[PDB]
From Swiss-Prot:
Its EC number is 1.14.14.28. Optimum pH is 7.5. FMN binds at residues 56, 135-136, 156, 225-228. This is Long-chain alkane monooxygenase. The gene is ladA. Changing residue 144 to C: Loss of activity with hexadecane as substrate. 2.9-fold increase in activity toward hexadecane. It comes from Geobacillus thermodenitrificans (strain NG80-2). Keywords: Flavoprotein, FMN, Monooxygenase, Nucleotide-binding, Oxidoreductase, Plasmid, Secreted.
Length: 433
């Protein structure tokens, strides 16, 4: 009955609300300060958030006007630092807050990734999640010196095998009680319980064994974000949590239902997939207070930064278009006009008092079948602070949000006490014996 809430973040300056770094209250320039991250983690745990959800890119937004220069000037996801580096400090200052890290299957080898995720699963005591992504920004393929550039759908096939490899390492290589720490017999780990995985496929050849001992979750909680038909299929097959695009009930409900249907052919119980929507919240004690914040942020909204983001995200360079050309069924003039507005993004914008925000959140949950939200920021830390001070108590009083954390791993916070490892109906469960 309780709504899962994640804080949506990225280790860079301009993430989603382009132009806002200028706002006098903002702290985006602190992205280089370790203290920003630990203070954030502490704030989010105070607000009982499920997790900090970190986006990432290793590509550059160089589509709009055929150059990275707009992205560079407007700080559109450049500079960007590595999100995995943040985790240990944030985990150190928190007890329950979990961490979902975006990391691409397209560039770096799974054997190194598997050890990194196992390491965080140990260090965080089972509070790590992985947002599995394929990446769509061409400068990454150039900079990792990829010889054969993979097509959109083929990137997801590579991701399938990438996950196959990680699942074998995480679930199958070392048996549950491999580590015995037996001083009498001088056996730290029973060598008969550590196994090669002997993986052999189209993209990878990985004899194994894994380098790490079994950690609390073994496999990190698996997120997916990617709305293409291939992406939704990938979600249905692998994801425990799905970050969906869409800003209304009809759209979100369609996608929730679509993914749950797709999951059946893989033998998955669709209730074993949680559905997350994006939401931007601008809240005040009174409507006028909310509107005052809205009007302030609107002043700083940078159309040019958004054009750069749109270019990288869609592949469409709009500078190359007459006002009067057509991309969907929308003129290019109308695409651009929607983009200079705060609610033009593919997330719900909720503006008003806490009763209203909560009402609108509750509506999406109850009518679209969504399980949680990734909270998108307009200002740091103001959006999160206002959400925590004003919306959280309203949600709590209504039974819609935890008053305090459940114990256990992040998977248990999501799926129930005792569900610390992937359920029997997940495909990774195949590799246990
Ligand atoms: C809600 C949402 C969030 C996303 N977050 C990221 C991200 O943080 N990093 C990234 O490279 N792609 C992100 N993407 C895009 C995809 O994860 C992926 O990179 C791919 O290029 C697009 O997938 P699709 O074509 O299957 O939709 C996101 C997509 C959606 C819908």
């Amino acid at each position: 009955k309780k709504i899962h809430i994640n804080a949506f973040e990225m280790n860079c300056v301009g993430h989603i609300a382009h132009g806002l770094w200028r706002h006098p209250e903002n702290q985006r320039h602190r992205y280089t300060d370790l203290n920003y991250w630990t203070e954030l983690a502490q704030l989010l745990e105070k607000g009982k958030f499920d997790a900090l959800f970190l986006a990432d890119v290793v590509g550059i937004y160089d589509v709009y006007r055929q150059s990275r220069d707009t992205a560079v000037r407007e700080a559109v996801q450049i500079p960007v630092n590595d999100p995995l580096m943040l985790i240990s400090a944030m985990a150190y200052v928190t007890k329950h807050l979990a961490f979902a890290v975006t990391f691409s299957t397209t560039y770096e080898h799974p054997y190194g990734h598997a050890r990194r995720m196992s390491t965080l699963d140990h260090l965080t005591k089972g509070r790590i999640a992985w947002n599995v992504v394929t990446s769509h920004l061409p400068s990454a393929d150039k900079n990792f010196g990829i010889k054969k550039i993979l097509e959109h759908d083929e990137r997801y096939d590579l991701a399938d095998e990438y996950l196959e490899v990680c699942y074998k390492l995480w679930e199958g290589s070392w048996e549950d009680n491999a580590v015995i720490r037996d001083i009498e017999n001088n056996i730290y780990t029973d060598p008969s319980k550590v196994h090669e995985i002997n993986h052999s496929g189209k993209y990878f050849e990985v004899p194994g064994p894994h380098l790490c001992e079994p950690s609390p979750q073994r496999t990190p909680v698996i997120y997916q974000a990617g709305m293409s038909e291939r992406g939704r299929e990938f979600a249905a097959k692998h994801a425990e949590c799905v970050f969906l695009g869409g800003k209304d009930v009809e759209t979100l409900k369609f996608f929730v239902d679509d993914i749950r249907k797709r999951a059946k052919k893989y033998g998955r119980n669709p209730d074993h997939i949680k559905m997350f929507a994006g939401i931007c919240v601008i809240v005040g004690k009174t409507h006028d207070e909310a509107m005052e914040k809205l009007n302030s942020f609107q002043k700083y909204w940078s159309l040019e930064g958004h054009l750069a983001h749109y270019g990288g995200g869609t592949g469409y360079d709009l500078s190359k278009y007459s006002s009067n050309d057509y991309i969907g069924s929308i003129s290019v003039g109308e695409i651009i006009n929607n983009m200079s507005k705060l609610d033009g993004k593919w997330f719900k914008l909720s503006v008003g008092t806490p009763k209203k925000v909560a009402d609108e959140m509750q509506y999406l949950v109850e009518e679209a079948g969504i399980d949680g939200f990734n909270l998108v920021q307009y200002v740091s830390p103001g959006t999160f602070v206002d959400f925590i001070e004003l919306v959280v108590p309203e949600l709590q009083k209504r039974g819609l949000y935890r008053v305090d954390y459940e114990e256990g791993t992040y998977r248990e916070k999501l799926f129930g006490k005792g569900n610390y490892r992937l359920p029997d109906d997940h495909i990774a469960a195949r590799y246990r014996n």
